[PDB]
Structure formats: structure tokens, C-alpha cells
Symmetry: D3
Subunit: 147 residues, 6 copies
């Protein structure tokens, strides 16, 4: 059972969608035992989006820099979030479109049982469009994985 006060998906999205200039939303999350990182990336290359999220997560200590296990979990969470952003073909520049995104990676246990271990959420919010400023609409995605 998902713990009602620890919904990692909902929390990662709330964090992304906040613009309160003095927030410390990160501080509260960290106090409650979550590992958190925020970033921004814009590209016509999906691999640049994936790379920014991985590099931010490893530098901020949200996932282990050593070994494959945690990188594997984060890659597949990122892929799942990209589905929401790309909506059928995981392609950007090759389909004459570009994205500008803010992202959040949240790590912790969202369940009632401490046996469920750590899980990870990757959330993405921004715009996708033709490569001409203004010819764009909003885009979102969330991917969740065990870690």
C-alpha cells in the first residue's frame, strides 16, 4: 500500500510545478528522508535530456555513481517519463521538434512497508514544439521505478 503522505510521484510533480522564489521545498523533502535533485535541460536530442538527468542525479547524490544497478533503475525511469513527453515516438530533432524542460528526481520509499525499499521518480515539465520560439505547447512525463 502507498503511504498517503509519501506519494513520490505526486511530490516530484508538485516540486517541479512550484515557482515560489524562496521555497525550501527541497529542504522539507530532505528532512523527511527523501533524496532530491532539480534541473533544467533543453534539446533536440533525447540523449542530451537523458544525460542531464543522470549527471544531475549522480552529482547531487540521488543515485550511486558506482556500479550499474542504480543507473539501470534511473535509465528505465527516465525512459518511462519520456513516454509522456514524446507521446508515441521517442524522437525530437528527427521529427522536427525540440523540448525545453525542468526535471525532478525523487528517491525514497513511498509505501507503508519499509520492506518495499527505495523507489525513484523522474518528472519532466516544459514545452515541446517546432524549432521556432512560440510554436510550442506544454509537455509532461513521470516515470517511476524500484531502486
Amino acid at each position: 500500500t502507498l503511504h498517503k503522505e509519501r506519494r513520490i510521484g505526486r511530490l516530484s510533480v508538485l516540486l517541479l510545478l512550484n515557482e515560489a522564489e524562496e521555497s525550501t521545498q527541497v529542504e522539507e523533502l530532505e528532512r523527511d528522508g527523501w533524496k532530491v535533485c532539480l534541473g533544467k535541460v533543453g534539446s533536440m536530442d533525447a540523449h542530451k535530456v537523458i544525460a542531464a538527468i543522470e549527471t544531475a542525479s549522480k552529482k547531487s547524490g540521488v543515485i550511486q555513481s558506482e556500479g550499474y544497478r542504480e543507473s539501470h533503475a534511473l535509465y528505465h525511469a527516465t525512459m518511462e517519463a519520456l513516454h509522456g513527453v514524446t507521446r508515441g515516438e521517442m524522437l525530437l530533432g528527427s521529427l522536427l521538434r525540440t523540448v525545453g524542460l525542468r526535471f525532478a528526481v525523487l528517491r525514497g520509499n513511498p509505501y507503508e512497508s519499509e520492506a518495499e525499499g527505495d523507489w525513484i521518480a523522474v518528472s519532466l515539465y516544459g514545452t515541446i514544439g517546432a524549432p521556432i520560439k512560440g510554436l510550442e505547447h506544454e509537455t509532461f512525463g513521470v516515470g517511476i521505478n524500484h531502486i
Copy 2:
């Protein structure tokens, strides 16, 4: 250009993820000229999700009950939101999974230019899982279309 105070996708999501008893977020949105609809649907059949969103939207007057044009726009917005929810295969029961969702449909012009006309956002949030309570994690999707 997207009008900063009129970001239809972000607004539909914030509406979805807020859990206030005396809220009236719907009142304020309608008071800013938005057409708004909230609902809930849980199913192992995608078609039931699509139908709830359509039926809710037509009944609350978010889209026209007559004609195809607006139904067409909402169907494709719904499909796009379902991508984020299903993440690769737009199947539920046939892949031994079930969803419980809250949805929001928001209709209005998110651009600076009045000439961009109305657009529609369909936003979905809930859980997806094995058909056993608790064997689930969060899921999310947003689709945006012109109308």
C-alpha cells in the same frame, strides 16, 4: 507565445493534485474564463477511461455535445494523456494491469494571441498496478490539443 498566467497544462495538473475540502479552484478558473471538468474512473479497460472523460466533458459543457470537431480534439488529447499513463502499450487488462484515476479537462486559450483560439488539456493521475490492491504505483499523463 504561451501566456505565463494561462499555462493550461500546468493549471490542469495543479487542479488534479490539490486535495482541499473547501477549494473552489474550479470557481476561480471559471472566473478566469476557463471551461473545467473533474472526474474519477478506474478500470481494466482503456475504453472505459476514454468514455468517462468524454461523457464528463460533454455533460459539464467543456466540449460541444453536437458534431464531431470537438469530440475529435478531445479524443486525441485523451490518447496523448494515455501515453503517459501506459508508457508503451495502450493496454490495461490484456497486460494484467488496472488503473484508478482522477482526471481534469481544461479548455481555453493559453497563448498571448487571442487568435490561437481554444485549446484543451486532459490530465490524469492515479495508480496503475497488478489487479491486487497495493501492488501498484503512481501514474500520470497529460495530453494537449487545439479545439
Copy 3:
């Protein structure tokens, strides 16, 4: 090299899109050595579409009733035509949509070299929509395979 007078795809489509009450377009094709069949099918189940095309093709002698080889070629041609019709998810009723189609299956060699053997084209034209008459638009697909 494709023979300019034997373009199996273009020919199958021209045949489908003709409504001339007295045509004998089939007779000319057959005189030029093509094997041809025409049919109609409407459904919310893709398997019913596939079945109608196979059963028509086998009854009209466009493909062999015995053995797997030709059935295999026709199945994969049908799948390719369905991509054009479904445009991302090869689902009908589960996504709250229905199709009504006319189809053509053409069999013969469209190349300059007689060594290229027989090929097959499956073409589909009709409407796809919500299950309410009139809430629909046109749909098309063509699949081509060696046989």
C-alpha cells in the same frame, strides 16, 4: 526497378477508390496477369478485419489455401496496412473506436525483372471513429510484401 505500368500499390489503391458502377477494372487487371480480390468489412475488432481479408483472399484464389508461406506473407502485409489505418496503436474497440472498410488484395510482380517473383499488396480505405454514426473521418492503409 519497379515497372512503371505494374505499380501494385498504386493499382490496388486506384481499384479501391473507384466507384464506377460498371467497372470491369478487375477484368483488365486479371487479363494483365494479376490475381485480385475486393471486399468490405466493418468492426471494433481488428481480428475480424484480418480474418475477412484472409478469407476473401483464399476463397478468390489470390493466395494458396494450403500451407503457411503465403498466409504468412499476407498476414504481414495486412499488419502493415493496418498501421496506416490505426496510426500508432493497433487497437479499435479497446480504444473506443470502430472502422468500416473496403479492401483490395493484389498479387503479382511489380518489377522489371521476372526474377523478383510475386508480391502482394493489401489496401484499406474507409472510415474510423467513435461508435456513433457520423463521428468519424477517413482512414487508409497499404501494406506490401514478397510472396
Copy 4:
């Protein structure tokens, strides 16, 4: 209801597949109130196909050069047509294939009700193959959207 004499998809395809020198099919269509555009594009990059269709459509006045609304409608119509052409993965050069295409974009109201507004059809026909002349077969795609 689709108006029998105004089937935008069928009309765009017939325009695409006819090869008359003194034709003026474009003249008759424009004389029935349609906005019409024909072109050719060959590439190993999908983005070049998308761009040719957009650039042709804007230049011939089939869609507005200003604003996003009509560009958005045409992009998604183009994506839908590309499904029929690519049949599973919306990739060309990265999968060692190339396309040579003719395209038609048709704009107008295909319904009985004037209230359905304008719709757009993008139709594509040509060959897809290995990057060696002659190692190819026909390909086809149609996408339809409200505008």
C-alpha cells in the same frame, strides 16, 4: 456525416495518384473551395519530409504562416500520414532506409454540417527502400486532422 462529394482523404489521394499533363484537378478543387498544395520530397531524414510539407503548405496558403494553431494541426496530420509510410518505427536513415515521395495537402470541410469547420488531409505516396536504386517498394500514408 461525411458529405459524399467532399471526402477530403479520398480526394487528396486521387490527386496524388493521377499523372495527367494537362490536368487542372487543382483548378477544380480550388473552384469547389478547397485549399490545395502538391509537392515532392526524398530523404533519409524524416525531419526533411515534415519540413517540405510544412514549407509547401505555408507558401501555397494552405495553412496560415502566422501563429501556432494551424501549424499544430498540420504537424499532427503529417505524423499520422508518416505512420502509414514507416509502419512501426518513424525512422528512415537510422534504419538504413530512404524514401522518395509525392505529397498532397488538402484543406476544407468534408462534412454535411458547415459547423464542422475546416479539416486537413496530408497524403503521401512513393517508394521506401534500401539506399540503392531499385531495392525499394511503394509506400503510402494519409493523416487527417481538424484545423
Copy 5:
């Protein structure tokens, strides 16, 4: 680094493909620390394939019967194996096809480093075809996930 003698994917496939040496191959794998499960399932419903693998895995103790974490890992491994089997649309009966499969689930650490923890491989081998005996060819899939 993958340990040469602990390649979980290759080992799971070898187990599946030997119908000579089953009884003691399982013995040897379990001796080396692997958790192992073998089974067979045939269906026109993907959900029945998924269920057979989960049920066999839990009953034979390859994954925890309690909690979600391990069920989640095995579900996504099974989805990945099913891609190889279905090759683009994760549908069986709805596309007029059926499968008969043998499956293997292997659990253990295939890496040099103990810190990589346990991983799981789901391997599938059999036939997919029209629902007429003999109108079929072979099919294979392997999915690998961290657990």
C-alpha cells in the same frame, strides 16, 4: 562488468533450449546459487502468459510472494521478454494470433561485483501463428531487470 560464468541471459536461454538435460541443469544452477523456475503456457491472451510466469515464479520461490518490489521487477522483465515475442504490438488474439511457449525465470547476480545485487531474466521460446495448428513459426524473447 558481467561475470563470464554468470551470464544470466545466456544461461536462461540454454536452459530453455535443451530438452535433453533439464532435470540436472536446474540442479546445477541451484547449486551455483541461482533461483530457477521453468514452465509452459499457451494462449491467445497475453495476460495469461504474464500470469503463468508470475504464478510459477512465486510458487517456486524465485521471487517473494509478499510485497510489490519483486513483483514489479518481474512484471517489467516479462514485458521486455514479450517484446521479442510480439515484435511491435503486444497483442495476440486481437491480431488473430496465438502462442505456445516454454519459459524460464532465473534470479541471481550476473556481475563481478556483489554490490550489483540480484537481477532477473525471463526467457520465452515457442511458436506464434494463426489459430490453426501448423500455420506458425518460432518466437523468442528475453527480458532482464534488477531485483
Copy 6:
């Protein structure tokens, strides 16, 4: 009906997975009437994988170097094998991943009936991962087509 002793898919995989008995396994297969080709390719570009398999197949005489028919069959077999390898998006470097593969192409008739003609199996085995040695797991794919 598939002939028990001529299962082209299973045979191609066994060939790939034995790094003990290569030299004379090829000899034995060729003795039994099979056309056989083995190779290796590593890349962040799918098109390089496709090309290596085609080039090896044509050079070793597994398929005709002349004409399109056999090239077409092998291309679609390779596409099917790649589904198992890529598991939902047929992309490598654009999704920040790389593969190192061994491959086998087998050609012959796996059925009881001579009338089924020749079929072709493309089998792939190796690793897919981040572009950092060791950050990888195993991958497999098999595609089967008539030729």
C-alpha cells in the same frame, strides 16, 4: 508443421550461444542443407547493425546479392530481431545506449513440407548499455521470415 529436427530459430540461437563448438557446428548445418552466416557488430547506430548483417549475409551467400526479393526478406527479419534487442524503441545512440552483438543468419526450410520453401532466421545476442564499459546487461533478438 515445423519439422522437429529443423527448427531454424532454435538452431540459429544454439549456434550463437556456443563459443565452444563453432567451427564444426557450421560444417554440420551446411551438411544438412542450411545456408549459414556468423558475425559480430557493435554500434550506437542501428543502421550499422543492419548493414553488417546484410553485408555478411550477401558475402557468405546466405542470400542473393542480386535483386530485391531476398534483401527485402532479410531486412524485415532483421527488424524483427531488433525488436527483441531494443524492446520498444528501435533506437540506440539517440537514447544514450550502445550494443555489442554476435549474430547468426540461417536459411532453409524448417517445415515438414518442401512446399513451404526457404525461410530465414536472424538471431542476435550480446549486451546493451550506457556508453561506459560494464554499465550493461545482456540482450537477445530473433526474427523469422519467408524467403
